[PDB]
Amino acid sequence: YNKIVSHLLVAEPEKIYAMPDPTVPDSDIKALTTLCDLADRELVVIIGWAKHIPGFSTLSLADQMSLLQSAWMEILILGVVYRSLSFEDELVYADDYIMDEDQSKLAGLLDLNNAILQLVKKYKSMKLEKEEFVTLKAIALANSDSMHIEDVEAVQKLQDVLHEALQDYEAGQHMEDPRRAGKMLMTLPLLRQTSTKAVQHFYNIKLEGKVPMHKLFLEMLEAKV
Amino acid sequence: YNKIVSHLLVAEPEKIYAMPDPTVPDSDIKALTTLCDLADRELVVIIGWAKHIPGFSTLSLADQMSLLQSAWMEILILGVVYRSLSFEDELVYADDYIMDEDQSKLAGLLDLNNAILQLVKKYKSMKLEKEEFVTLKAIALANSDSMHIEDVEAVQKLQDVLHEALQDYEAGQHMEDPRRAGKMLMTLPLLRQTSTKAVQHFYNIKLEGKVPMHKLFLEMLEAKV
Ligand SMILES: CC(C)(c1ccc(O)cc1)c1ccc(O)cc1
Numbered sequence: 001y002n003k004i005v006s007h008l009l010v011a012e013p014e015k016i017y018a019m020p021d022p023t024v025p026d027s028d029i030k031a032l033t034t035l036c037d038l039a040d041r042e043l044v045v046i047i048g049w050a051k052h053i054p055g056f057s058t059l060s061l062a063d064q065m066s067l068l069q070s071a072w073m074e075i076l077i078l079g080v081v082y083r084s085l086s087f088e089d090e091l092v093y094a095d096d097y098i099m100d101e102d103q104s105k106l107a108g109l110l111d112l113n114n115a116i117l118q119l120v121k122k123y124k125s126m127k128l129e130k131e132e133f134v135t136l137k138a139i140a141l142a143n144s145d146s147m148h149i150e151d152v153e154a155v156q157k158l159q160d161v162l163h164e165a166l167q168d169y170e171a172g173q174h175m176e177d178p179r180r181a182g183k184m185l186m187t188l189p190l191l192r193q194t195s196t197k198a199v200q201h202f203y204n205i206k207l208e209g210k211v212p213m214h215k216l217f218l219e220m221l222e223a224k225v
Numbered sequence: 226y227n228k229i230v231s232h233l234l235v236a237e238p239e240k241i242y243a244m245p246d247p248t249v250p251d252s253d254i255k256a257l258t259t260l261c262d263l264a265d266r267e268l269v270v271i272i273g274w275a276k277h278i279p280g281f282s283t284l285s286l287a288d289q290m291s292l293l294q295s296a297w298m299e300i301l302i303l304g305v306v307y308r309s310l311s312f313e314d315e316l317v318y319a320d321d322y323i324m325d326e327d328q329s330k331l332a333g334l335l336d337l338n339n340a341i342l343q344l345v346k347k348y349k350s351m352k353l354e355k356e357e358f359v360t361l362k363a364i365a366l367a368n369s370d371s372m373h374i375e376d377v378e379a380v381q382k383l384q385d386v387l388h389e390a391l392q393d394y395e396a397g398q399h400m401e402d403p404r405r406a407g408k409m410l411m412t413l414p415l416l417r418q419t420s421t422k423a424v425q426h427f428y429n430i431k432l433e434g435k436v437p438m439h440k441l442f443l444e445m446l447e448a449k450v
């Protein structure tokens with residue numbers, strides 16, 4: 001099929017581990033510390049991954065940073081959604097960190113994790129493919145609506161190149177549904193909504209000061225609130 | 226062109242007036258009272274308008290209510306965006322109520338109104354047509370991601386019928402841009418984001434108790450928070 005899609009597939013990063021501390025008693029603080037720690041390390045991987053998107057590394061460093069600062073939370077959440085597709089009512093943050101309803105309750109994440117499960121259920125019913133996943137991830141990056149973009153034309157071109165890839169892929173692989181590309185795009189508002197709420201939630205947790213957070217995650221949280 | 230589009234055009238409601246109280250001194254409280262009062266009356270008009278969308282009135286009353294309860298804020302904001310297209314840095318809430326930067330500052334709405342202006346600027350550059358406007362409004366209603374839907378198949382069919390109309394319209398009227406429909410759909414995440422933030426803001430203002438709010442607006446605010 002489409003070359004941008006196959007390129008995005010080979011650029012897809014390796015899974016990383018949560019490694020929750022086995023000497024520490026389970027609590028809300030432990031789960032949150034674990035999750036924030038995992039996200040901090042994934043952000044490093046996401047920065048590396050973005051460099052493989054055609055056109056991205058030719059934007060100015062400022063525009064690259066602006067896109068990443070706007071989109072990072074949506075990209076993280078899309079990841080856990082995709083990892084969770086073949087599970088039921090469980091969220092696979094990592095192979096060694098799967099949250100069910102009870103742990104979500106414990107961590108104070110029930111409402112947020114329930115919103116993420118709503119995303120999972122929608123992609124389950126549409127039978128989201130890996131090809132579609134990696135392309136939406138790139139589109140979420142490019143369509144992240146940063147207020148601080150310099151070369152808007154270049155960013156729009158980036159959006160168009162990725163949108164075309166999605167369109168091309170869907171035309172060749174899903175002839176039975178000529179509106180599948182548009183259906184995929186219409187899942188983006190729920191991703192943006194959930195991401196907006198997630199940024200607010202973890203910012204409150206930053207302010208409360210009981211959960212340790214690393215520099216990158218904090219920096220990224222700061223730029224979005 | 227497409228019949229659903231022409232039908233949505235004739236179903237488009239009359240503009241209503243803000244009628245700010247001319248005996249009351251300008252303040253944050255006056256602006257907010259005016260805006261909330263305007264929204265309350267527009268919600269009545271939006272309920273009436275929805276009945277004209279093909280398929281909508283055949284959903285159960287519960288599913289109709291669920292869609293409206295999820296989508297109402299996006300529909301209000303899309304309205305002010307459309308009214309503001311031919312203005313510069315001004316938001317036309319009504320013909321007798323146009324907010325500039327200073328009044329937004331006064332009302333404590335600078336950040337929220339700046340997000341709405343970001344929407345305006347994006348549709349200006351794409352040259353949003355009235356045909357496209359009324360169709361996106363209907364799509365925002367149908368794609369509102371309520372958690373409490375009963376007949377999901379019927380709602381998805383509603384989404385598909387409206388998405389097809391957009392697709393049909395764009396194919397016939399904008400042959401020069403075969404991705405225009407998808408570009409329109411990719412504006413929806415910014416609308417959802419702004420609407421999510423707006424619901425949080427006015428809910429805080431509800432809690433503070435200094436701004437009088439009518440029953441419908443309060444009821445709708447309650448169902449979304
Ligand atoms: C940002 C967050 C810590 C996270 C961590 C890791 C991850 O892969 C995806 C998301 C997160 C967000 C929302 C949420 O409900 C749980 C965890």
Ligand SMILES: CC(C)(c1ccc(O)cc1)c1ccc(O)cc1
Nearest residue numbers: 260261264301302305337338423
């Ligand atoms: C909901 C609100 C009072 C409104 C009132 C009327 C309207 O047409 C659109 C929006 C509103 C939301 C966000 C905002 O920044 C100003 C006013």
